[PDB]
Amino acid sequence: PTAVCSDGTRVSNAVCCDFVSLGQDLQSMVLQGDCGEDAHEIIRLTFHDAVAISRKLGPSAGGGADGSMLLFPLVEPEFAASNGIDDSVNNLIPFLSLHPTISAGDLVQFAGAVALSNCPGAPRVQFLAGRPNHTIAAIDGLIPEPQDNVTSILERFDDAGGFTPFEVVSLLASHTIARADKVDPTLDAAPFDTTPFTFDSQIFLEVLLKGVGFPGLDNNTGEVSSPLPLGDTSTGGKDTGLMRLQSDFALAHDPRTACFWQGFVDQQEFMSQSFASAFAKLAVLGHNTDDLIDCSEVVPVPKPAVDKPTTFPATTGPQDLELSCLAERFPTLSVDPGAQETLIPHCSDGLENCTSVQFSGPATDS
Ligand code: HEM
Ligand SMILES: [Ca+2]
Ligand SMILES: [Ca+2]
Ligand code: NA
């Protein structure tokens, strides 16, 4: 039967109401209403938790979106491909005992949905509940890495859950709110687009610009040249320059994926809806949805998309594009004014001094 939660929310199932206080605690204790570092980490964790599953190897290889990262924090978070995932894992573990009726698998996915809701332009994703509260650790080798080629990436996603090339590119819209701490050992929080606190299509445009240098070292595995490498970290600042992943570059230019990649440029609603659909599929890997219950109503309404059009960042323009898609013309867009690169802020408030919640815990890094 239907019910009304303590916050006034109408749900199709009263068990959904347990998630209301969980969302409140996730915000008050970790996410702080922001599309910031901790939100980004948790969204990355939804993927590392979910994708560790394989049709061809069978169920013993991993249970998908099963909370295995939280329940066995000494195993998967320390595999090489998950270096750095410990921060999100250690931030979520305490919620398992604070909200003991909610499984680790549900916790990971619900935290991701709440985190996304803090990001202007992000979709309000589906949330199904009821993932069982026990599993085993996945094997190593199931998480794509940034040095991987497109054939490998596409095969891994197909084997994980039958994702199509379009769905893979759609999921990578998440790199619109993403930075790197481990790719370059000399850099912290190197952003993948110029708006890492905004769920927009800048990532799609900016990967298509010609690379001109590196924000740090020039020879890191999985990294390629960036179109906007300038930061202020050489003078002690925290506004790290923009980083480009080899995998994002490869997706942007491969015949299977390049038109899907370009098709999101300046198509905010199409991008966000496409991400939402593929992400809902990711979130239930390892489960038959018939065995889950719809608790989508308890995902917070996301911050609205920003008013700002999609534009070329200062000092760039259409002459800098490297295009690969014949099927669709790249749209005419304005160029942000300015003679030098604009520093990409380290914080959603535009400053450099913001700090993030980090709980101690059992997962480790490097
Ligand atoms: C081919 C598939 C993918 C590859 C190779 C990849 C690679 C990476 C790498 C190397 C980083 C930086 C980690 C670090 O050094 O700190 C990163 C960050 C991130 N990834 Fe991906 N990723 C992929 C797919 C996805 C998907 C499917 C999602 C979610 C739907 C996702 C969400 C994120 C987020 C939110 C971050 C930022 C984390 C932070 O700023 O703390 N990624 N990814
Ligand atoms: Ca898992
Ligand atoms: Ca962005
Ligand atoms: Na990070």
Numbering used by the authors: -1 to 364
What did the publication describing this PDB structure actually write?
Fungal degradation of lignin, a key step in carbon recycling in land ecosystems, has been described as an ‘enzymatic combustion’, in which high redox-potential haem peroxidases – the so-called lignin peroxidases (LiPs), manganese peroxidases (MnPs) and versatile peroxidases (VPs) – play a central role. Recent evolutionary studies show that MnPs evolved from fungal generic peroxidases (similar to plant peroxidases) by developing an Mn-binding site formed by three acidic residues near the haem propionates, as shown in the first MnP crystal structure. The genome of Ceriporiopsis subvermispora includes 13 manganese peroxidase (MnP) genes representative of the three subfamilies described in ligninolytic fungi, which share an Mn2+-oxidation site and have varying lengths of the C-terminal tail. We have solved the crystal structure of the extralong MnP6 from C. subvermispora after its heterologous expression.
At the same time, the first crystal structure of an extralong MnP was solved from this fungus and was compared with the known structures of other MnPs. The upper domain is mainly helical with a first structural Ca2+ ion, whereas the lower domain contains α-helices and a non-ordered region stabilized by a second Ca2+ ion. The recombinant MnPs include two structural Ca2+ ions that are incorporated during in vitro folding, but have never been in contact with Mn2+ or Cd2+. The first crystal structure of a short MnP has recently been solved by Fernández-Fueyo et al., and its comparison with the first extralong MnP structure solved here shows a C-tail extension (Gly348–Pro365 in C. subvermispora MnP6) surrounding the entrance of the haem-propionate channel. Such a disposition limits the access of some substrates through this channel, as revealed by diffusion simulations. The tail goes up to near the top of the protein and then turns down towards the region between the Mn2+-binding site (haem-propionate channel) and the main haem-access channel. At the beginning of the tail, the long/extralong MnPs present one extra disulfide bridge that forms a turn pointing towards the surface. The last two differences result in a protrusion below the Mn2+-binding site that causes some access restrictions in long and extralong MnPs. 50 was observed, revealing that the presence of the tail does not always result in decreased MnP stability. This is explained by the numerous interactions with the protein body observed in the extralong MnP crystal structure, including three hydrophobic/hydrophilic patches. The tail, which is anchored by numerous contacts, not only affects the catalytic properties of long/extralong MnPs but is also associated with their high acidic stability.
